[PDB]
Amino acid sequence: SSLIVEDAPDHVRPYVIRHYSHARAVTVDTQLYRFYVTGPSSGYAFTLMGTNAPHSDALGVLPHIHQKHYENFYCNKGSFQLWAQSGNETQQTRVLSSGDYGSVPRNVTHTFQIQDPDTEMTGVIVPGGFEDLFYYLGTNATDTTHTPYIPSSTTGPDSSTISTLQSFDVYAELSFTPRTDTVNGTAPANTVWHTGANALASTAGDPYFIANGWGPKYLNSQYGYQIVAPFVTATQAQDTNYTLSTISMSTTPSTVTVPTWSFPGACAFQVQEGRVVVQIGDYAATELGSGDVAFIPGGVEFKYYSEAYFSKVLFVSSGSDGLDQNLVNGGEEWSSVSFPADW
Amino acid sequence: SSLIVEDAPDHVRPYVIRHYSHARAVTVDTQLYRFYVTGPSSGYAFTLMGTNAPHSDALGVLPHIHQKHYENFYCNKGSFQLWAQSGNETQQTRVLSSGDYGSVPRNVTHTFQIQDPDTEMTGVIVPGGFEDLFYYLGTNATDTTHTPYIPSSSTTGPDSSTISTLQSFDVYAELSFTPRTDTVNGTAPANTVWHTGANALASTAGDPYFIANGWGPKYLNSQYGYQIVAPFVTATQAQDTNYTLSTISMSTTPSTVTVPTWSFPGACAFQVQEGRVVVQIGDYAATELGSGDVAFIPGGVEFKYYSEAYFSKVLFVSSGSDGLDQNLVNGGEEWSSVSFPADW
Numbered sequence: 001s002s003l004i005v006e007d008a009p010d011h012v013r014p015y016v017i018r019h020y021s022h023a024r025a026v027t028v029d030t031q032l033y034r035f036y037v038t039g040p041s042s043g044y045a046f047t048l049m050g051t052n053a054p055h056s057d058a059l060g061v062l063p064h065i066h067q068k069h070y071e072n073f074y075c076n077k078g079s080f081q082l083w084a085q086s087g088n089e090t091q092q093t094r095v096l097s098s099g100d101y102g103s104v105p106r107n108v109t110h111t112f113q114i115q116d117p118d119t120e121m122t123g124v125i126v127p128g129g130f131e132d133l134f135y136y137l138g139t140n141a142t143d144t145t146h147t148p149y150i151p152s153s154t155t156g157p158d159s160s161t162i163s164t165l166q167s168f169d170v171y172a173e174l175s176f177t178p179r180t181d182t183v184n185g186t187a188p189a190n191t192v193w194h195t196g197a198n199a200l201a202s203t204a205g206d207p208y209f210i211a212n213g214w215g216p217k218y219l220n221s222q223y224g225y226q227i228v229a230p231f232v233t234a235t236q237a238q239d240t241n242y243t244l245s246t247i248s249m250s251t252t253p254s255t256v257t258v259p260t261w262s263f264p265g266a267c268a269f270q271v272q273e274g275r276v277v278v279q280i281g282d283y284a285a286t287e288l289g290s291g292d293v294a295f296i297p298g299g300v301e302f303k304y305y306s307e308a309y310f311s312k313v314l315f316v317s318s319g320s321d322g323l324d325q326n327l328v329n330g331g332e333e334w335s336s337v338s339f340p341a342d343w
Numbered sequence: 344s345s346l347i348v349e350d351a352p353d354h355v356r357p358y359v360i361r362h363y364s365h366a367r368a369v370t371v372d373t374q375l376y377r378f379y380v381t382g383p384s385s386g387y388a389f390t391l392m393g394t395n396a397p398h399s400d401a402l403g404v405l406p407h408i409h410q411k412h413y414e415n416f417y418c419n420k421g422s423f424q425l426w427a428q429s430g431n432e433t434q435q436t437r438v439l440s441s442g443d444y445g446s447v448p449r450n451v452t453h454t455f456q457i458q459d460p461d462t463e464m465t466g467v468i469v470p471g472g473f474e475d476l477f478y479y480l481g482t483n484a485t486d487t488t489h490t491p492y493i494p495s496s497s498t499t500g501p502d503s504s505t506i507s508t509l510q511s512f513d514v515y516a517e518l519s520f521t522p523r524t525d526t527v528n529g530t531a532p533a534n535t536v537w538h539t540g541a542n543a544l545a546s547t548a549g550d551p552y553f554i555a556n557g558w559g560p561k562y563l564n565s566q567y568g569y570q571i572v573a574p575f576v577t578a579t580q581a582q583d584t585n586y587t588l589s590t591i592s593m594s595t596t597p598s599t600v601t602v603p604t605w606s607f608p609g610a611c612a613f614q615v616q617e618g619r620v621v622v623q624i625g626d627y628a629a630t631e632l633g634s635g636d637v638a639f640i641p642g643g644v645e646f647k648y649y650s651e652a653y654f655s656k657v658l659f660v661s662s663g664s665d666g667l668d669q670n671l672v673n674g675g676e677e678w679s680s681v682s683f684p685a686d687w
């Protein structure tokens with residue numbers, strides 16, 4: 001029919017959805033949510049959503065936990081503060097700016113606050129279907145012009161109502177007090193934020209944060225150069241059974257055949273920088289730019305390559321051995337965000 | 344010949360140059376410079392260059408002044424700190440992250456330091472031709488794969504002896520400048536506004552100033568779909584350097600609105616920051632630009648542009664006082680959001 005769709009399909013199929021497409025949009029006060037990948041569109045594998053919002057002096061949501069969902073916060077642009085705490089571990093907070101990442105495993109108390117005027121948060125939540133919460137809390141938005149968001153109490157449900165959302169896997173943590181001793185975008189002191197390497201948490205269940213470019217990286221040289229920066233591996237996902245990362249890409253040299261991939265689990269990516277061509281199943285090849293999302297059903301063959309000299313995508317895969325993990329296993333440890341200057 | 348080029352042309356003509364094209368690449372230590380618009384390519388109107396670099400614990404250049412060039416620093420991605428001081432005024436510094444902007448007029452002392460691993464600075468320097476300095480001090484880079492910078496603590500670039508010798512290049516050393524070290528939350532001195540509130544352009548020419556992404560003044564133009572101009576340099580600050588600089592954010596063009604043709608006295612250019620923008624210049628094919636791609640339009644050449652993405656943002660520069668950004672401002676209204684209205 002058409003590979004490109006304006007809202008996520010109501011069933012599993014190859015699709016691309018452009019940045020700021022309608023995507024069943026709702027607003028929650030000033031925040032505008034778009035559901036690029038849903039439970040029905042992914043066969044319940046994962047939800048990929050974008051939230052665009054203006055600066056707020058108040059929290060963007062009351063503190064809460066998910067018992068059954070793993071949540072991932074990625075800052076596409078602008079900035080937002082994220083607070084997280086597992087059990088009786090020290091409360092952590094970071095101010096995420098463009099390309100920064102925050103990991104929120106099951107049973108981790110969290111909240112966020114939108115700082116900059118042009119802020120966009122990409123949420124990847126596993127398993128899929130978590131969006132039903134926003135269908136309830138939000139008000140449908142026609143947003144005819146596709147504007148990123150519509151131009152101080154805490155945003156969202158009040159204390160009574162947030163304590164009423166257990167059926168959507170939201171559990172209130174009303175006694176949680178977000179720490180107020182942030183300095184240079186982090187607290188407590190003696191955390192590393194934009195000043196040094198960030199490791200993935202070695203302990204399952206603990207939150208962690210990776211500043212843009214400061215996490216572990218792997219160079220794969222098999223099909224041109226690709227650099228995988230892991231955000232979630234089997235160590236962290238455990239039974240939620242997924243991977244999450246960015247993949248950075250060179251062009252494919254004309255002497256290299258662009259490979260054909262197929263994996264048992266669904267996967268998806270959102271372009272962050274550059275221009276990436278995707279050919280999925282029997283559909284025409286389509287070039288994606290900033291914020292565009294490609295979705296590939298499990299078991300469907302696909303090909304992708306970068307038309308830009310350098311592109312970076314945020315990538316999610318259902319399963320323990322999707323594309324990013326395959327590229328890591330076929331690659332080597334690498335200490336740069338740039339690939340070699342020679343083939 | 345063809346619209347799309349791998350290095351900027353050697354004479355004035357319409358062209359498009361893709362992000363990370365060769366663009367007469369040079370390195371200076373760890374920094375890789377690319378010259379998307381040059382003096383010769385713009386008829387000396389302006390230079391638009393991109394510098395990609397990894398984190399450094401040292402300054403990216405020794406402190407210095409330009410007497411005849413106005414420098415503009417825009418953070419495409421990553422982050423870098425910028426220091427600046429004019430005459431008798433207090434020394435200012437900000438840590439710029441994606442979409443942030445720092446203005447450095449003639450006769451303002453300045454230096455910078457690269458903070459994050461994947462940092463990209465776009466420099467717009469007026470008038471054009473300043474890039475000779477980077478040819479001269481730089482080392483030619485072939486960069487076959489077009490990698491953003493070459494993978495790999497003294498101050499980067501010329502030593503103090505060398506930088507005191509570069510007057511011909513309009514570089515004057517300020518070796519007694521001490522970059523302030525009391526940065527907190529990305530700014531010093533403490534009594535400044537950075538990512539916490541509105542930023543104004545300088546009240547007059549000659550003074551440095553900084554605009555954090557989304558926090559400067561904005562104007563909505565509704566004549567051709569919705570466009571939001573966020574000025575960075577106006578006639579007030581440019582004076583005789585005679586240019587304007589801003590971002591322009593764009594909606595799609597509604598089917599009932601004709602995409603306008605423009606033809607300006609002076610050369611103009613833009614680099615896409617977010618989104619997908621089609622440009623149709625002269626008799627060349629409509630061409631779609633993505634992140635970091637640059638379009639250059641000579642004065643006197645007709646062109647049309649529109650956004651294929653639902654929202655695009657470009658960094659825009661024009662020679663003259665009445666280029667595209669100022670035209671859209673004059674035809675528009677003050678506006679307090681980085682988003683345009685939800686209805687046409």
Ligand SMILES: *[C@@H]1O[C@H](CO)[C@@H](O[C@@H]2O[C@H](CO)[C@@H](O)[C@H](O)[C@H]2NC(C)=O)[C@H](O)[C@H]1NC(C)=O
Nearest residue numbers: 081095179180181182183184185186527528533
């Ligand atoms: C640096 O920025 C942080 C915000 O990230 C400031 O922390 C705030 O401090 C005030 C006053 O103590 C508190 O009431 C707020 O709740 C704090 N915010 C957060 C999120 O921690 C801090 O004041 C700034 N430091 C300086 C010197 O400007």
Ligand SMILES: *[C@@H]1O[C@H](CO)[C@@H](O[C@@H]2O[C@H](CO)[C@@H](O)[C@H](O)[C@H]2NC(C)=O)[C@H](O)[C@H]1NC(C)=O
Nearest residue numbers: 183184189424438523524525526527528529530
């Ligand atoms: C917050 O970040 C700033 C840098 O932006 C740190 O500033 C440095 O502080 C050290 C020790 O005082 C100085 O030696 C450096 O010269 C400073 N750098 C700059 C660029 O000003 C600051 O220490 C950080 N604050 C905290 C409490 O961690």
Ligand SMILES: O=c1c(O)c(-c2ccc(O)c(O)c2)oc2cc(O)cc(O)c12
Nearest residue numbers: 028051061071072121122123156157170
């Ligand atoms: O439970 C909630 C939640 O998780 C998130 C969220 C938002 C953006 C993301 O990118 C993300 O990963 C999660 O927002 C909310 C907003 C509300 O008003 C109420 C909620 O209960 C949540």
Ligand SMILES: O=c1c(O)c(-c2ccc(O)c(O)c2)oc2cc(O)cc(O)c12
Nearest residue numbers: 371394404414415464465466500501514
């Ligand atoms: O004079 C100089 C200068 O201005 C800049 C510069 C760099 C990036 C920008 O984006 C910009 O606007 C200016 O770098 C330099 C680097 C050197 O090694 C020596 C110099 O003399 C300069």
Ligand SMILES: *[C@@H]1O[C@H](CO)[C@@H](O)[C@H](O)[C@H]1NC(C)=O
Nearest residue numbers: 066067068105106107108205
């Ligand atoms: C999360 O906490 C709940 C309630 O205490 C517990 O039943 C559950 O096993 C925990 N889940 C995980 C994945 O740790």
Ligand SMILES: *[C@@H]1O[C@H](CO)[C@@H](O)[C@H](O)[C@H]1NC(C)=O
Nearest residue numbers: 024025026135138139140141
């Ligand atoms: C909001 O949109 C959904 C999805 O189309 C629809 O089911 C629902 O009825 C809408 N709500 C209202 C109140 O119209």
Ligand SMILES: *[C@@H]1O[C@H](CO)[C@@H](O)[C@H](O)[C@H]1NC(C)=O
Nearest residue numbers: 241264265266298318319320
């Ligand atoms: C993980 O997901 C993959 C792909 O969806 C699937 O093949 C596999 O059965 C899953 N494994 C587990 C342990 O559930």
Ligand SMILES: *[C@@H]1O[C@H](CO)[C@@H](O)[C@H](O)[C@H]1NC(C)=O
Nearest residue numbers: 409410411448449450451549
């Ligand atoms: C810059 O300083 C030089 C040397 O003092 C002076 O001659 C020149 O006129 C100044 N230019 C401007 C625009 O202020």
Ligand SMILES: *[C@@H]1O[C@H](CO)[C@@H](O)[C@H](O)[C@H]1NC(C)=O
Nearest residue numbers: 429430431432433450549550
């Ligand atoms: C700055 O201060 C000095 C004296 O310290 C003075 O000579 C100079 O004229 C002042 N600058 C201006 C522009 O007034």
Ligand SMILES: *[C@@H]1O[C@H](CO)[C@@H](O)[C@H](O)[C@H]1NC(C)=O
Nearest residue numbers: 369370481482483484485486
């Ligand atoms: C050009 O660059 C190379 C390294 O890329 C350097 O060795 C060489 O001297 C430079 N100049 C010439 C004349 O090739």
Ligand SMILES: *[C@@H]1O[C@H](CO)[C@@H](O)[C@H](O)[C@H]1NC(C)=O
Nearest residue numbers: 585608609610642662663664
């Ligand atoms: C300013 O630039 C415009 C466009 O290039 C040019 O036509 C005009 O002559 C310039 N004005 C002055 C006084 O330099």
Ligand SMILES: [Cu+2]
Nearest residue numbers: 064066071110
């Ligand atoms: Cu949550």
Ligand SMILES: [Cu+2]
Nearest residue numbers: 407409414453
């Ligand atoms: Cu300079």
